[PDB]
Amino acid sequence: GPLIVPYNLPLPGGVVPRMLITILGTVKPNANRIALDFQRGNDVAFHFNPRFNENNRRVIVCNTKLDNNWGREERQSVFPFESGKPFKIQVLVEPDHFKVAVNDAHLLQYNHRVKKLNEISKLGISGDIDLTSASYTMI
Ligand SMILES: CO[C@@H]1O[C@H](CO)[C@H](O)[C@H](OCc2cn([C@@H]3O[C@H](CO)[C@H](O)[C@H](OCc4cn([C@@H]5O[C@H](CO)[C@H](O)[C@H](O)[C@H]5O)nn4)[C@H]3O)nn2)[C@H]1O
Ligand SMILES: [Cl-]
């Protein structure tokens, strides 16, 4: 039913273009944050971080963490999440970027900074959600 957050989903042999990762959940009421962390060991290859109240604004912050240092942030002000509401996040790995759609609407893409895609072998899912489902498939 509801998975335990923080949740770790192993990605056997890392990611690869045409790999589709689907996260189903519901945002808690008065949520503060969501985070998806595609990890290469201790490094975070792709950090996807909806923030519900940063100086009274809603923003999605994306970044990469290498040897414990966060890089240059990429910010998107389109913010499809709402507290209390069910969502679907789809992360499709493409040759040059992660492509993210929420609720079947394209949201953003994030260019690969970590190059060893087949070593990005785990997805951490955390934040103020009830997590229903997390899975992957090759399309
Ligand atoms: C148009 O221009 C802009 O107009 C704006 C109008 O409000 C502001 O004036 C802008 O400058 C101020 C400003 C401040 N911040 C951030 O605000 C934050 C709290 O919401 C923190 O204080 C941030 O610094 C500490 C911090 C670090 N991290 C880590 O970031 C990682 C991803 O990179 C992961 O998410 C980690 O998990 C997370 O810990 N988190 N917090 C701070 O950098 N963003 N912008 C200005 O540029
Ligand atoms: Cl790399």
Swiss-Prot record:
Intracellular or extracellular location(s): Cytoplasm; Nucleus; Secreted
Superkingdom of the organism of origin: Eukaryota
UniProt binding sites for a beta-D-galactoside: 70-76
GO biological process: eosinophil chemotaxis; epithelial cell differentiation; innate immune response; macrophage chemotaxis; monocyte chemotaxis; mononuclear cell migration; mRNA processing; negative regulation of endocytosis
GO CC annotation: cell surface; collagen-containing extracellular matrix; cytoplasm; cytosol; extracellular exosome; extracellular region; extracellular space; ficolin-1-rich granule membrane
Alphabetized GO MF terms: carbohydrate binding; chemoattractant activity; disaccharide binding; IgE binding; laminin binding; molecular condensate scaffold activity; protein phosphatase binding; protein phosphatase inhibitor activity
Modified residues annotated as Phosphoserine in this record: 77
UniProt entry tagged with the keyword Secreted: yes
Short sequence motif named Nuclear export signal, residue ranges: 115-130
Keywords of this entry: Acetylation, Cytoplasm, Differentiation, Disulfide bond, IgE-binding protein, Immunity, Innate immunity, Lectin, mRNA processing, mRNA splicing, Nucleus, Phosphoprotein, Repeat, Secreted, Spliceosome
Domain (Galectin) ranges: 7-137
Tissues showing expression: A major expression is found in the colonic epithelium. It is also abundant in the activated macrophages. Expressed in fetal membranes.
UniProt subunit comment: Probably forms homo- or heterodimers. Interacts with DMBT1. Interacts with CD6 and ALCAM. Forms a complex with the ITGA3, ITGB1 and CSPG4. Interacts with LGALS3BP, LYPD3, ZFTRAF1 and UACA. Interacts with TRIM16; this interaction mediates autophagy of damage endomembranes. Interacts with cargo receptor TMED10; the interaction mediates the translocation from the cytoplasm into the ERGIC (endoplasmic reticulum-Golgi intermediate compartment) and thereby secretion.
Function (record text): Galactose-specific lectin which binds IgE. May mediate with the alpha-3, beta-1 integrin the stimulation by CSPG4 of endothelial cells migration. Together with DMBT1, required for terminal differentiation of columnar epithelial cells during early embryogenesis. In the nucleus: acts as a pre-mRNA splicing factor. Involved in acute inflammatory responses including neutrophil activation and adhesion, chemoattraction of monocytes macrophages, opsonization of apoptotic neutrophils, and activation of mast cells.
Protein name per UniProt: Galectin-3
